[PDB]
Symmetry: D2
Subunit: 336 residues, 4 copies
Amino acid sequence: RELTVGINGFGRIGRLVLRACMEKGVKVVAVNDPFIDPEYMVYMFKYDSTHGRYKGSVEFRNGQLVVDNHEISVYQCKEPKQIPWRAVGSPYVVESTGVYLSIQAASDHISAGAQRVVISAPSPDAPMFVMGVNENDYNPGSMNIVSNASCTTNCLAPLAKVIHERFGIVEGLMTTVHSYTATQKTVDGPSRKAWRDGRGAHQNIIPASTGAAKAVTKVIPELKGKLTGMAFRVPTPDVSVVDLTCRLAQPAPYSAIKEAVKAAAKGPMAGILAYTEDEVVSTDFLGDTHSSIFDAKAGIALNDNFVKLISWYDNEYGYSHRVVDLLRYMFSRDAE
Amino acid sequence: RELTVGINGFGRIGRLVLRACMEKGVKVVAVNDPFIDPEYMVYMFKYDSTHGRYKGSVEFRNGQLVVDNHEISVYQCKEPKQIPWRAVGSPYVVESTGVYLSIQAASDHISAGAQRVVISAPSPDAPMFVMGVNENDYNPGSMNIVSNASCTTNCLAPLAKVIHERFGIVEGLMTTVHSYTATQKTVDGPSRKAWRDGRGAHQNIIPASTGAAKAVTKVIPELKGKLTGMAFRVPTPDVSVVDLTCRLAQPAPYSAIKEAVKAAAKGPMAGILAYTEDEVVSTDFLGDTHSSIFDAKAGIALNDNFVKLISWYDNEYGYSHRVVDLLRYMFSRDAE
Amino acid sequence: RELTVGINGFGRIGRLVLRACMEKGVKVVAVNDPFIDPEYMVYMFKYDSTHGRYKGSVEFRNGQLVVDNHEISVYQCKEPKQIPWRAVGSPYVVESTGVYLSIQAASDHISAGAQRVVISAPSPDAPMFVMGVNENDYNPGSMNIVSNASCTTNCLAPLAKVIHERFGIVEGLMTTVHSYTATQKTVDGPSRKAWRDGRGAHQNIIPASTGAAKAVTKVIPELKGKLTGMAFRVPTPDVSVVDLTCRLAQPAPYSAIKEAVKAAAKGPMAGILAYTEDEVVSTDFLGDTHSSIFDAKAGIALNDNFVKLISWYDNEYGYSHRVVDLLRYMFSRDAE
Amino acid sequence: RELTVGINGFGRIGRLVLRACMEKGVKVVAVNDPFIDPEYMVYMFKYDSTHGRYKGSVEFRNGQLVVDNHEISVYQCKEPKQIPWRAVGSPYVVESTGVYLSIQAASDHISAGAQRVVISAPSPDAPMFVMGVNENDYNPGSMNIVSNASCTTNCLAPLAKVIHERFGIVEGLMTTVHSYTATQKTVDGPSRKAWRDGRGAHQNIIPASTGAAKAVTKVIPELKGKLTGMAFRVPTPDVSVVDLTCRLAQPAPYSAIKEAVKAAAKGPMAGILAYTEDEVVSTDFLGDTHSSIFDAKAGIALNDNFVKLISWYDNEYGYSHRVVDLLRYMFSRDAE
């Protein structure tokens, strides 16, 4: 009768998704990771450089991870096919390894026992959702596997939706100034598919490709062809900011832009898109659970039709919470 | 008969302008700074965290700073009026303290003995120059005091000039992702005129106002009303990047944008604007003496009329060299 | 009938002492700072890059700072002698500006109506106290102005006491590997009294003098002449670590060293000195309220009489809580 | 008739040993790395975030790496035994991958045709050499595989020798305050063998084990049992500093300590051990080719027999130059 969750991979998104589940009362029945044994999972979950010590209890005993006295099964399978998901009640599975992105690859979870799969990363072919934008397009019959898109897409789409629906977006170009991540290197090292991403992450501003802005045009079809962008990786370990430069159809004096965002944040997009007029900086959004926080004082307009809009996101914490939100939402629709 | 230079202030721009003078064979006859005595000036000039040890010799003896066996007079005057510029041959003076920006304030140098003044910072009323863009607008009779604009304006204007003259700029919005500076704080401290700039510089992405993009519309009058922008201060100690989002009149497929920049870099803007197709990151421009380095692979286009252009600058080193370039240029025009 | 506290200075220690007071239920009745008005105080207090958003409510009204609905008077006096401590009931005053350190300088607070003064920094002549080590030597009858020593002294002294009393320290040399602070510079800038300290804090490992080890011999007299030390400032914004290399008189196999510290932490020094065997790093102590956290696994012994002991401290947060603890203790003794 | 060098591994030490070879005029005839092709080698070699652009020319052609017009063969073999060292004239081989450290593992290079092997890292069994300390113990007749020890061993050993020989070391404990390296992580990630080392390198001060101090007792036998140590990894990308706390046998006032190091640096250890009295910080040693730079002003003495001595090293650049120096020395002795 209840929503139960299994997590594949115990990287940053895996661990932070478990925190978000504990916060929101969602029961996690198991974690799979081939390289991290239970006693080490305890340590990695407990201590976090970015988000502080876990605010409950974390122990292991009897080969089990134990979080707030909830016992969590631990497997060590190298391949999704091997995971005894049936042995833990066929949970919804979060697929967070970053290496099984296609519907096909992910589907090994289903063969193994998983009721649904949320891929915590963009997917080439799996259907893609952004809470607050298009979750009511989830089709429980035909969708056994979904993607929660990217952290960056989750920041941008709520905002794009609001601006477009109010003023119409003729065209826009996005920069995200983004914290470095686990895919980067501490000092100049090998990154043969993307040379810049090898260069030392703490020393450099690193230009990087991203599909995030374009992905927005998939969860918001009417923006097809009107959005793209790029990224600069900078030396901060978490929190990122969207810089959307857009041409708007209807006149859009900045006061009306502020009132539109405010109304969305107070109403339909509450808990997803937030609004602030404070003199904020990136660390003020560490631990923020919103997908997108509009920075009113930071944006600039050239005129009533050409504007730069600024929105923050905790690229780790916002997105992890949205994965749990998606799971909960899906579960409330799969009982039909 | 020769160009001689005096420097007021021995902050980063003061010290780096002296390096650029030594590099380019320009004779500096004196430095003024009330707080930094000669023996300490030796130390600060010799050792640099960002640009390495001075590659010549630096000593003091007989109350004098001595650089490469060129003896440099040192004064300790708190006010520009007091500086015996006549005592050192009425040099051209670089005014680099950041606190005498108006024609009026700066003119105290002239009362004190200075032939011309270059203000190494934007000025509200003083005439403003960007080498490669508008230096042939310098009027030797009426201009006793000029500003070399900002580091950021020197990055953007060469590029704007090229793009506008080739394709026409309808409108553009600029972000600079910029290294932190001396005006910032190591940890959250007081910045009552601009609250965000108080927050710890190494920990944060900090949105900030800048007049740089607008300043471009002053050295390039035909762009009046068509450019503005803003800044993010990020945790790197030097090198910054311009992200210009612009709508162009003439069609501007990216290949033609690349060919226009390349032609300018190879020709009229050689030594000012450079062009690269390498997989570069910010540290690859430490010590670069160009005002502006176009990053061909980093830019993105939505279509032939809406594009994001990326250009790097060593915000300390490029600008310091341009100050020396301005001085040399002015001197070659004041003998008329 | 109850402790009330005035705080001179709203720098990092002033703001974080105010947090500690709210956490421990100590009434603060005024803050003085000539440069920071109430509205800006709200902002500086509410948002912290290191320690996060204040967990509670912060507003201004009626020229007052209001924290969790407790109203706090705000004065703007440049000098202690001018602050109307009498008008707010003659509280205990925390002198946190770092420029009134002698009994003579700090006594201007007394002459302005302060009941007592705690200097949140080493004093050349005021009596010095480390909670857990020597607070029992405070005497209300003879002492109206006291020093809470430094953050570093508060980390080493509790460890030195445990170790001296159990084994006897023959001699010891300390290094502290220490986060940068507000006295440092974002980029190479002026620091005429200590040239290294002007070099860019986030770029460098910076050797510095410190009297913290010698200060321990002031609060633990029997160690007179047996301890000194030095510091390295490194590119982290908070949390620091003591590295004590000492020769011990009695045999001291590491297992006994461990049982002695553990014993002190569970009993007489509980809340002051903590003990851990986990694989900790500096961020694991952000927000830690202990003065000193012994890291059992990080230390190393050459032999039974020559060992290197490692202890962590949040140099901001531990010290601030100790300031409040000394205030409460002093008040509990002033009822005599 | 001349030294030729093959390099296995094009990681940081491989690339910087190649730089050192070009600077010192040592012919490199091949590089092996299974993962990095010639075109990517050109890029990794040409641009360096820490040490700047290669000062010279770098190209690829004909499946070769070409540096300052010297052609260098490139192999892509996963195993030493497979590299055709014979085909390039049986050079001396630098084993720089860090995973062939035993005589047995490194001897596969010999079986593949290498004349000699220098392991650029500590070896469990191969003979270990520090230039300036014990290179005189190398013997071509018995030794075809050698270790150049570690960066840290090369900083401490030259200082320990000078101090032991002048004063006698009774006992010593070392800390190295050390830049992060490629074995570390940008954000909390996996490190199952050393849990601390997986924690985010730029966020943390990280305690670590090191055998560097004990290794000094291998190259200076008379110090057997008299030295051990540990490390803190801190958020800088290069340059590190040894902090030696030692008890000395003969009286050793600091002025004599200073004259002993100065004497060694001007004479027998010139180019290996340097001496400075300036107010230096870590960035002042970027690109320094010494093994060890004694910092006179940073050290402190408790008394004539118990002192803390501080020495700097560029852990990348000094060590790399030492690898080349050992190669040249070995070759000068193989003509016997």
